[PDB]
């Protein structure tokens, strides 16, 4: 870019703004990383639900098999009284990230039931009780994925600003400072020094001419 005092001021302002924006983006990325760590911890904690509720559902299934032998299956698939599975979605916002929220049958709205099997009460209390845990796990996984993507984007932007933009601007500021002070200021003194030399030469010539008379 062309070096000038106004250009130097503009470059300094751009560097200051870049530093401020980098700090703000680092803060946002740190907050998003904290939220992602919390979501990962929650998912790890709720992973054990997928084992506990599964064991309970297995026990209920064994009890139902011992009660009525082979389930009807086929047309109605049997094995349950609840869980008319229908899923509804919601969008929450955390640190500017649109974290989805999930609700479904036996874990929210859109649920219905009718009759059931012999142990259908037990099956609902164990096999259909895992529905809430599954919905929570799915919501946690979706939130973790969204947070990971947003954190990756923010970290890429922050790293680019720290490495490329600021280190691009600062050499430009140094070159602009050098071009002005290193050349224009030096030339101004040299021009004036040569002018003073011309004046001194004129005075000396006048004095010598007067003395020769």
């Amino acid at each position: 870019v062309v070096p000038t005092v106004t250009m130097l001021g503009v470059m300094k302002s751009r560097l200051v703004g870049a530093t401020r924006g980098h700090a703000l983006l680092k803060k946002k990325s740190d907050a998003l990383t904290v939220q992602f760590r919390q979501i990962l911890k929650n998912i790890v904690t709720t992973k054990e639900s997928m084992g506990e509720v599964m064991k309970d559902s297995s026990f209920a299934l064994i009890e139902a098999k011992y009660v009525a032998g082979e389930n009807i299956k086929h047309i109605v698939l049997e094995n349950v009284q609840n869980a008319s599975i229908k899923v509804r979605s919601r969008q929450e916002n955390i640190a500017g990230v649109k974290i989805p929220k999930f609700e479904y049958f036996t874990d929210g709205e859109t649920k219905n039931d009718l009759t059931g099997l012999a142990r259908g009460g037990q099956q609902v209390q164990q096999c259909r009780a895992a529905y809430v845990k599954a919905i929570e796990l799915l919501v946690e996984l979706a939130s973790l994925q969204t947070s990971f993507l947003t954190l990756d984007e923010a970290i890429k932007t922050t790293n680019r600003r720290v490495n490329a933009l600021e280190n691009v601007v600062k050499p430009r500021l140094e070159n602009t400072i050098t071009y002005i002070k290193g050349e224009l200021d030096e030339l101004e003194r040299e021009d004036f020094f040569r002018l003073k030399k011309i004046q001194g030469y004129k005075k000396r010539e006048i004095e010598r001419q007067l003395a020769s008379s």
């Binding site: 890429k156 932007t157 680019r160 490329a164 933009l165 070159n175 071009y179």
Partner: protein
């Protein structure tokens, strides 16, 4: 210090017609010609239009195509320096392709080898025609491949199924002109025909 704001350089460029500017970065990367294709310029391209026409009608157009490819490569590099190699359009990927080839196989010259000490003009013409033909065939495949996935995303597949012709394109610069003018022109023509047939068949196979 390399700055082109020096009084000598400014006064020279105020009157010189053709200007082969050089970049220190390319010299650092052992490029050798070191001619920065983005800043250099030549006002004499207008006068030599008659010579180009009586030589080859293709060159006047493939030159513009190559210049456009270079400008697009510069813009893409500027974008990817911060966005990242992902999320690039397959057309943009095909543009960066053969732009790498033009950089490392056409503009680059060793200048201390039996092959790159001298280079006849029409040899460079055939090199440019081959590179532009590769670019045009790739973008023709991108335009229509019996589906968007089969049209443009297939560059990775091309990199393998067409790898031999790509290697021959990048290695066609290694042949010394002292090996006989008809020999080199025949080799260039054969390479062009082989690449054309292979890529046309591949674009006409499964799509």
């Amino acid at each position: 210090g390399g700055d082109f704001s020096d009084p000598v350089t400014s006064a020279t460029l105020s009157i010189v017609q053709v200007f082969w500017g050089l970049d220190k970065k390319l010299a650092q990367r052992k490029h050798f010609p070191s001619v920065n294709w983005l800043i250099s310029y030549s006002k004499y391209s207008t006068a030599l239009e008659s010579f180009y026409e009586q030589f080859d009608p293709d060159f006047i157009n493939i030159r513009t195509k190559a210049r456009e490819v270079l400008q697009r490569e510069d813009d893409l590099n500027e974008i990817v320096q911060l966005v990242g190699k992902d999320a690039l359009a397959e057309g943009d990927k095909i543009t960066l392709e053969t732009a790498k080839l033009l950089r490392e196989d056409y503009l680059a010259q060793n200048a201390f080898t039996p092959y790159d000490k001298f280079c006849p003009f029409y040899k460079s013409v055939w090199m440019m025609r081959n590179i532009i033909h590769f670019y045009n065939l790739a973008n023709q495949a991108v335009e229509k491949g019996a589906g968007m996935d089969g049209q443009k995303i297939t560059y990775t597949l091309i990199k393998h199924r067409l790898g031999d012709l790509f290697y021959r394109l990048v290695s066609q610069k290694f042949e010394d002109p002292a090996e006989g003018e008809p020999a080199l022109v025949a080799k260039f023509k054969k390479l062009h025909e082989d690449l054309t047939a292979g890529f046309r068949a591949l674009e006409d196979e499964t799509r």
